[PDB]
Design a protein around this ligand. Structure first.
Ligand SMILES: [Cl-]
Lengths: 422, 6
């Protein structure tokens, strides 16, 4: 437990071994205190010295201690990461990726992940310095299982950070260069590798349809659906996020998710005890019901409408909001038969019960659904017996009370329904 | 996004 000035005195000595002991003392400060003195280290001017120690191939111990110390500085604020980058650390770490000492190469991987994890600017600067080639070469082995578990996990996590962030998204050529390795990692049988691999995919699919196509063309959808059914929550969460991103694209992209068997998993996802899973599963459903009518029919066939009625009936409000969207898209693009079936499953009552929430956006969504439901009844000549349903469950008391609502389109559609069916 | 080695 040295003081910062003692560390300074050692690193400023003209003795490599005294520099080594001081650098190690710094590393222990930065890795053992709950609130490490990163800023005091930076202010003392030690970052340039640490960076210079990265290049002392004749003393692998001081390479490791400096790499560890800089890794933990880089794991702090954007300003602390910037101090590491400003000391010229990026090229020095990339040159350590070729080290014959596995624990040193791993530490350089770790440090680069923290730098890239700061944002799109440093992510792209790591790429411009040529980090991808040597990173991917560390995984150019016939069987990933022969690599150390902690080593492989750190490589996967750092790669996911190179896929991370938008405004802008990673360079297209960088994504194409990484994807083959990501796909291979997506099949490795370690829970942590799988989780971070799914996260990387979820980042790459969070964008316009051309980005989604890059991923879907690699044929990873069936594997994502498989991980969607995993028992480890840390895997299901990113797998579901990736699947949800894919279904925001075209109807053809959404169809690959359906063809892979995704809908069969949603009974459990839509009743999953983790609130976030249920919410994201219902968001995914809302983008499937906005597709073609034959895709709406697969939702019906898989028995998922009762589950939408269930979430609409009882769930976290954010989840109910997503379900309301799911029903509006359903009724806008669905056939008359499909809309009739939706009523026969009990959609109306829970739909009405949600017309008394403190959220203007959901009321609008609900009222558009009712209109598109009434529209389907007009085409069948029984707007009456639907009006009674909405009456018997207390739906007319709400819609009446919404005509006197302080908002643009609430009383608009409210008046319209009242005076056209009631 | 960032990890310290502790
Ligand atoms: Cl029935």
């Amino acid at each position: 437990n040295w003081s910062v000035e003692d560390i300074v005195k050692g690193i400023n000595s003209n003795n490599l071994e005294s520099q080594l002991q001081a650098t190690q003392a710094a590393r222990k400060l930065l890795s053992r205190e709950k609130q490490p003195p990163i800023d005091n280290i930076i202010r003392a001017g030690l970052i340039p010295k640490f960076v210079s120690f990265l290049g002392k191939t004749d003393c692998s111990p001081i390479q490791f201690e400096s790499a560890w110390a800089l890794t933990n500085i880089a794991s702090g604020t954007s300003e602390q990461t910037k101090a590491v980058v400003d000391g010229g650390a990026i090229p020095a770490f990339i040159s350590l990726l070729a080290s014959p000492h596995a624990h040193i190469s791993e530490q350089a991987v770790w440090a680069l992940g923290n730098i890239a994890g700061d944002g799109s600017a440093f992510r792209d600067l790591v790429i411009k310095h040529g980090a991808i080639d040597p990173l991917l070469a560390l995984l150019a082995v016939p069987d990933l299982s022969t690599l150390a578990c902690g080593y492989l996990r750190n490589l996967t996590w750092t790669l996911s950070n190179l896929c991370r962030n938008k405004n802008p998204a990673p360079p297209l050529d960088a994504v194409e260069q990484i994807l083959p390795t990501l796909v291979r990692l997506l099949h490795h049988n370690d829970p942590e590798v799988l989780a971070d691999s799914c996260w990387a995919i979820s980042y790459l699919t969070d964008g316009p349809n051309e980005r989604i196509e890059m991923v879907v063309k690699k044929g990873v959808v069936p594997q994502l659906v498989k991980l969607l059914g995993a028992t480890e929550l840390p895997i299901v969460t990113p797998a579901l996020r990736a699947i949800g991103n894919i279904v925001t694209g075209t109807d053809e992209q959404t169809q690959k998710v359906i063809d892979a068997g995704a809908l069969a998993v949603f009974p459990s996802l839509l009743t999953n005890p983790k609130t976030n899973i249920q919410k994201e599963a219902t968001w995914t459903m809302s983008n499937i019901t906005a597709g073609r009518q034959d895709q709406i029919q697969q939702v019906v066939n898989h028995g998922l409408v009762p589950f939408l009625v269930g979430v609409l009936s009882k769930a976290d409000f954010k989840t109910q909001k997503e379900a309301a969207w799911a029903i509006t898209n359903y009724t806008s693009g669905g056939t008359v038969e499909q809309i009739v079936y939706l009523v026969h499953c009990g959609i109306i009552e829970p739909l009405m019960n949600l017309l008394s929430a403190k959220d203007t956006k959901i009321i609008q969504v609900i009222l558009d659904a009712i209109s598109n439901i009434f529209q389907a009844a007009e085409k069948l000549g029984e707007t009456e017996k639907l009006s009674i349903m909405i009456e018997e469950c207390g739906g007319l008391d709400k819609i009446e009370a919404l005509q006197r609502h302080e908002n643009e389109s609430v009383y608009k559609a409210s008046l319209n329904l009242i005076e056209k069916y009631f | 996004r960032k990890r310290a080695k502790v």
